[PDB]
Amino acid sequence: VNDLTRRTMTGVMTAMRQVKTMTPFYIQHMCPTELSVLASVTVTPPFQV
Amino acid sequence: PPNRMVYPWPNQPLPRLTVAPTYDSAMSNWISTTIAFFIRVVNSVNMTAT
Numbered sequence: 001v002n003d004l005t006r007r008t009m010t011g012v013m014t015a016m017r018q019v020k021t022m023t024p025f026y027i028q029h030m031c032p033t034e035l036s037v038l039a040s041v042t043v044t045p046p047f048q049v
Numbered sequence: 050p051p052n053r054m055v056y057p058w059p060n061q062p063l064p065r066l067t068v069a070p071t072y073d074s075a076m077s078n079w080i081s082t083t084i085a086f087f088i089r090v091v092n093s094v095n096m097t098a099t
């Protein structure tokens with residue numbers, strides 16, 4: 001792989017790692033609440049293992 | 050106090066002879082240091098990776 005492209009690839013990968021996305025926070029703190037509430041609403045209760 | 054005014058920058062009395070651009074005024078100093086800082090920012094590792 002020519003280094004110019006190689007330099008580009010590590011660059012774009014770095015950019016992805018720097019995006020200030022909200023999803024990871026939502027998974028850890030907010031999504032569980034939504035599940036906990038909706039569990040009482042669906043016609044079929046949750047079934048886990 | 051009466052007959053006085055405040056001023057955000059340092060000030061001097063009016064010059065005597067012809068004017069010319071200078072480089073020791075407060076604003077000029079503020080400009081130079083600001084530029085110097087950002088240049089340092091651009092060369093920081095964070096920029097180099099991308």
